[PDB]
Design a protein around this ligand. Structure first.
Ligand SMILES: *[C@@H]1O[C@H](CO)[C@@H](O[C@@H]2O[C@H](CO)[C@@H](O[C@@H]3O[C@H](CO[C@H]4O[C@H](CO)[C@@H](O)[C@H](O)[C@@H]4O)[C@@H](O)[C@H](O[C@H]4O[C@H](CO)[C@@H](O)[C@H](O)[C@@H]4O)[C@@H]3O)[C@H](O)[C@H]2NC(C)=O)[C@H](O)[C@H]1NC(C)=O
Lengths: 81, 289, 162
């Protein structure tokens, strides 16, 4: 859809993953930390497609990355409960 | 084209090599209707005749001060500035991206207290024909008044500029619900750019360092005071403190602590808002012994 | 009287839990264009509500009515589908302890005889899990701002009004 919305969504993901990562510091951890880095490594690769200026495939990937993040969040919250 | 201030206009341009730019129509600001000629900047070459002048704006050679005259007398002036749009993005050539706390951070602001006063600074490498203009409000749809001073050089190391602002009707104790907006116009020659920052005062708080740090020996009692600039009453605007020997650290809400001077001497104390996680002050330090 | 020293301890504890109960973002993150309009429906300790030091000396009932209102509002929110829906948080979670601290403090302010409980304007929370998650961050940082003011009020009242 819009190019502006996609970059905003990436920024939100970047902020969110930064917050979960920092929160984990205050408290399988090694497995989750490896999974986080792989998404970021993927976020960077996706970001390069953007600075070239597919769209449909990126929107599908944002939703898929969002699904991975939600799963991580649920595990972490369960670990502190 | 829109009016930036009296007799000053901004022309937005999609900026790329050989771009056709934008057509503009200037109107001489006069009641008169006959015997008018137009010039640009210092040249006396008449660019056109009549009440209005049509020009194609596509590069900086087409910008500048257009003047209409009649009977040898100047009637009015119109300064045209260019705002470059590069790939759908407005240019940010003039200010340096500080990249903290995130990308595209050009302005940094700090407050020493909840008074409603704060300071903002930005950086540029450009030394030439450079003008900044600062306006501020609280809220965008229903803006509340904020008065700022002039932006001026505060350091050279890369040139740093600073400006002072103060909310007209501040409520130090209230819970802010609308952020402060800071807006900076930047003009380099005929290149116009602008910049914005949005924040709550509470998020840019950074207290001054602890005051009057003193030591009392005991058969090493540390004491200090709140900084003069911090919000009053201290019983309301409470601070918390970090005491470090240098890591050997303790945290306290008191203005005193007892420590052991092990190493060669270093003791240091810094301060933070007790109830809201904003920035730590710079350290105050006193040598042991 | 409102038992200031007990309110200081519970409101101080709220500040600790408000920052520790849940992951955080930067103060400039998750900002969006509609935030300016959305803020009006949430209650705030505003200018003139009596929670400044001078207002508390004259009549603390105004401020304490407002603080109570805000605690009830955030409680209703933390118990809503925003926090209990997918991705679900358990009642024993840190946020559940934070919810309990809001409830614990609000019970203390409501005197004898006066009734300050109202009705919520619940509206309807989001339906997509990702949008629920984003709203949790925004709500909790709004709560952080509110409880900071409350903690100052109670710290000041215990020190000067007891
Ligand atoms: C930072 O940089 C950005 C990017 O350049 C600037 O954005 C521009 O800001 C100016 C001023 O805020 C905007 O100018 C406005 O243009 C409007 C025209 O809108 C349409 O409608 C009219 C008919 O109503 C058409 O004729 C026109 O062609 C447009 O299609 C004006 O309506 C605005 O108000 C003017 O007129 C009213 C009376 O009608 C007066 O009361 C006002 O004082 C004013 O004279 C205004 O002129 C411009 O549109 C913005 N850019 C874009 C792309 O939209 C920022 O302004 C700049 N800095 C700041 C601080 O904003």
């Amino acid at each position: 859809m819009s190019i502006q919305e996609i970059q905003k969504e990436i920024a939100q993901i970047q902020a969110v993953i930064a917050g979960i990562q920092k929160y984990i510091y205050t408290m399988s951890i090694e497995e989750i930390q490896k999974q986080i880095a792989a998404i970021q490594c993927q976020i960077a690769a996706i970001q390069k497609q953007i600075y070239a200026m597919s769209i449909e495939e990126i929107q599908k990937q944002i939703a898929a990355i969002q699904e991975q993040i939600l799963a991580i969040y649920k595990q972490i919250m369960a670990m502190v409960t | 084209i829109w009016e930036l201030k009296k007799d000053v206009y901004v022309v937005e341009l999609d900026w790329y090599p050989d771009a056709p730019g934008e057509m503009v129509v200037l109107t001489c600001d006069t009641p008169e209707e006959d015997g008018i000629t137009w010039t640009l900047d210092q040249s006396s070459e008449v660019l056109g005749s009549g009440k209005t002048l049509t020009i194609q704006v596509k590069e900086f050679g087409d910008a500048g001060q257009y003047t209409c005259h009649k009977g040898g007398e100047v009637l009015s002036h119109s300064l045209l500035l260019l705002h470059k749009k590069e790939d759908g993005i407005w240019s940010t050539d003039i200010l340096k991206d500080q990249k903290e706390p995130k990308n595209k951070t050009f302005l940094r602001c700090e407050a020493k207290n909840y008074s409603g006063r704060f300071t903002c600074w930005w950086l540029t490498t450009i030394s030439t024909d450079l003008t900044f203009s600062v306006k501020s409000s609280r809220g965008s749809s229903d803006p509340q008044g904020v008065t700022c001073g002039a932006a001026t050089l505060s350091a050279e190391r890369e040139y740093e500029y600073s400006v002072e602002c103060q909310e007209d009707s501040a409520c130090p104790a209230a819970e802010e619900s609308l952020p402060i907006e800071v807006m900076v116009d930047a003009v380099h020659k005929l290149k116009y750019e602008n910049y914005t920052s949005s924040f709550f005062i509470r998020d840019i708080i950074k207290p001054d360092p602890p005051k009057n740090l003193q030591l009392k020996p005991l058969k090493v009692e540390v004491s200090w005071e709140y900084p003069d600039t911090w919000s009053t009453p201290h019983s309301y605007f409470s601070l918390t403190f970090c005491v470090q020997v240098q890591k050997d650290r303790v945290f306290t809400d008191k203005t005193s602590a007892t420590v052991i001077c092990r190493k060669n001497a270093s003791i240091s104390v810094r301060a933070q808002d007790r109830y809201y996680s904003s920035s730590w002050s710079e350290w105050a330090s006193v040598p042991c012994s | 009287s409102p038992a200031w020293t007990q309110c200081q301890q519970l409101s101080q504890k709220l500040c600790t839990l408000a920052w520790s109960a849940h992951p955080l973002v930067g103060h400039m993150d998750l900002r969006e264009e509609g935030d300016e309009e959305t803020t009006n429906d949430v209650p705030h300790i505003q200018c003139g509500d009596g929670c400044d030091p001078q207002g508390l000396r004259d009549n603390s009932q105004f401020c304490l009515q407002r603080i109570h209102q805000g605690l009830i509002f955030y409680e209703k929110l933390l118990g809503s589908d925003i926090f209990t829906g997918e991705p679900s948080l358990l009642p024993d979670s840190p946020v559940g302890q934070l919810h309990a601290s809001l409830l614990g403090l609000s019970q203390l302010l409501q005197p004898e005889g006066h009734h300050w409980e109202t009705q919520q304007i619940p509206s309807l929370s989001p339906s997509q899990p990702w949008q629920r998650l984003l709203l949790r961050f925004k709500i909790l940082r709004s709560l952080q701002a509110f409880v900071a003011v409350a903690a100052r009020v109670f710290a000041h009242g215990a020190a000067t009004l007891s």
